[PDB]
């Protein structure tokens, strides 16, 4: 899976993954999230939501029809999940290369932190932590390396 749910070089960039590129660009602009949650897929999420809410962050969620109740229950501006059964969702009322640069796009619209949720593989945690470093974002999770991204701001 790899689709979003809501409810300029930026254009040349988004295009790579052209009319819905501009649409799912206005996504990132309108709300302008302050936080992205990264999870596996449900107690993990309730935490992260109010952990993020602890800093009053309006947030997006990323993970790999429960997905529709996350909106009421958590207040997300958007969810990104990772065939083609998206049509079911659209009805119900919900709409070489460096893919990591999307972080820079979100940052310019106001992204401030990543929040890593429980159960992420080590692979995923270091990837989220590399991104916090390289895009100057905060990342929120036993010791020193909880704040690695601040201790070693240049990678």
């Amino acid at each position: 899976a790899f689709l979003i749910v809501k409810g300029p070089s930026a254009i040349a960039f988004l295009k790579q993954f052209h009319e819905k590129a501009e649409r799912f660009f206005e996504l990132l602009v309108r709300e302008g999230v302050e936080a992205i949650i990264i999870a596996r897929g449900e107690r993990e999420i309730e935490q992260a939501a109010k952990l993020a809410r602890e800093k009053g962050f309006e947030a997006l969620a990323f993970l790999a029809d429960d997905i529709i109740e996350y909106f009421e229950r958590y207040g997300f501006k958007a969810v990104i999940v990772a065939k083609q059964a998206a049509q079911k969702i659209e009805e119900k009322g919900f709409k070489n290369h460096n893919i990591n640069d999307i972080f820079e796009l979100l940052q310019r619209q106001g992204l401030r932190a990543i929040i890593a949720a429980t159960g992420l593989s080590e692979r995923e945690l270091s990837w989220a932590q590399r991104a916090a470093q390289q895009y100057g974002l905060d990342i929120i999770f036993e010791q020193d390396n909880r704040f690695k991204h601040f201790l070693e701001p240049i990678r």
Binding site: S9, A12, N98, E104, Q134, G136, P153, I154
Partner: protein
């Protein structure tokens, strides 16, 4: 693969915005010196991502020739490009970046100010000291945090009393960072303010205070640290225990002796184990 580097090099003059920035990215990853001058040119592309990407790619090749052009990119209209230029220079590590970075401490974008403070920290040039001491006053908490991290890493004694005062900050991130930086500098004047910080509401502050007291290795911390063994937070506890071993001696070996006798819980366990060792 020289044939690939050259192709990406010509790709830098393509009409497609996308081809230009994807070429600067790829060159950055290859890391071949021959791309330096062509990338120096891309630092002025009409499109910001291309520029952003040229600056990043030069940070990665690490060639000292990129320094003066990167110093210019620090003034770019776009704040992303300025961030990318400050990051690239801190990574190159060339002392000519120093006064321009010091100027970036005053950028209107709070990320730029933050990564400028970090770049400074990485270079380690003592000239950054007083300006980084200004930045402990920044309206932005992350900038205040970054400055204290950079001061700890630089290790200059002048940072001490300004860091002490930062233990009084309203934000728990800066308090955490001030304690950590004080532990690293290791000036004994931190010992008393850190003892207070062991009683902080934020458990991330108490943890760092305890760690910082362990590094300092002054003895006035022993009893305040014996107490922290009864801390509700598990990590504060383990760290207090770590800190006690780091400050060896007999005064703690005597606190450890009575504690093995009249102690319960975790605190009793570290007592026996320490005594079991030395």
């Amino acid at each position: 693969d020289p044939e690939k580097v050259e192709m990406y090099i010509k790709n830098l003059q393509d009409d497609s915005t996308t081809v230009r920035f994807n070429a600067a990215y790829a060159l950055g990853k290859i890391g071949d010196e021959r791309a330096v001058e062509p990338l120096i040119k891309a630092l002025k592309d009409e499109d910001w991502l291309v520029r952003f990407s040229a600056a990043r790619a030069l940070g990665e090749i690490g060639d000292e020739r990129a320094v003066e052009p990167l110093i210019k990119a620090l003034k770019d209209e776009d704040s992303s490009v300025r961030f990318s230029a400050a990051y690239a220079l801190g990574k190159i590590g060339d002392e000519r970046a120093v006064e321009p970075l010091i100027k970036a401490l005053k950028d209107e974008d709070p990320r730029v100010r933050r990564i400028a403070a970090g770049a400074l920290g990485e270079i380690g040039d003592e000239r950054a000291v007083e300006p980084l001491i200004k930045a402990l006053k920044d309206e932005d908490p992350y900038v205040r945090m970054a400055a204290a991290y950079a001061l700890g890493k630089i290790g200059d004694e002048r940072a001490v009393e300004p860091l002490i005062k930062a233990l009084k900050d309203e934000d728990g991130y800066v308090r955490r960072a001030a304690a950590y930086a004080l532990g690293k500098i290791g000036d004994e004047r931190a010992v008393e303010p850190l003892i207070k910080a062991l009683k902080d509401e934020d458990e991330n502050v108490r943890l760092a205070a305890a760690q910082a007291l362990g590094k300092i290795g002054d003895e006035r911390a022993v009893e305040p640290l014996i107490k922290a063994l009864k801390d509700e937070d598990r990590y504060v506890r383990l760290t207090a225990a770590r800190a006690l071993g780091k400050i060896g001696g007999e005064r703690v070996r005597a606190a450890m002796e009575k504690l093995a006798e009249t102690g319960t819980g975790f605190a009793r366990k570290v007592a026996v184990n320490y005594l079991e060792t030395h």
